[PDB]
Amino acid sequence: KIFKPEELRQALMPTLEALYRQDPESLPFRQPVDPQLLGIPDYFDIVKNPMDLSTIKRKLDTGQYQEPWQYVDDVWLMFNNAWLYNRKTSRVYKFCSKLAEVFEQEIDPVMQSLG
């Protein structure tokens, strides 16, 4: 099980695409949280390892995932950051849960075909 970077990218991209295509639910995740702009200075005290869809795309595009599970970990990291920081009935949390639902449905067959 060694992965050619461009094949790993071609296999995983559709799952990322499916997250981006969710409108409105992807919109808070399409770019990084900037706590200084938002005036939420407690954010990096709770979210130690920020992640968002733009960063995941960059990493997927520049060979930073050697194995499929590192991509999965980063998608879950984005979700878990939102779920820990935000109120359960908040738009961000509700939106996050939708992306998670989409990801769960998308990722499973893909991971089985990879290994």
Residue numbers in the entry: 1083 to 1197
Publication excerpt:
Bromodomains (BRDs) are protein interaction modules that specifically recognize ε-N-lysine acetylation motifs, a key event in the reading process of epigenetic marks. The 61 BRDs in the human genome cluster into eight families based on structure/sequence similarity. Despite large sequence variations, all BRD modules share a conserved fold that comprises a left-handed bundle of four α helices (αZ, αA, αB, αC), linked by loop regions of variable length (ZA and BC loops), which line the Kac binding site and determine binding specificity. The four helices form a deep cavity that is extended by the two loop regions (ZA and BC loops), creating a largely hydrophobic Kac binding pocket.
Indeed, ITC experiments showed that the binding affinity of many BRDs was significantly increased for multiply modified peptides. For example, the KD of CREBBP decreased from 733 μM for H3K14ac to 131 μM for H3pS10K14acK18ac suggesting that many BRDs recognize a pattern of modifications rather than a single Kac mark. As a consequence, BRD acetyl-lysine binding sites are deep and largely hydrophobic binding pockets that represent attractive targeting sites for the development of Kac competitive inhibitors.
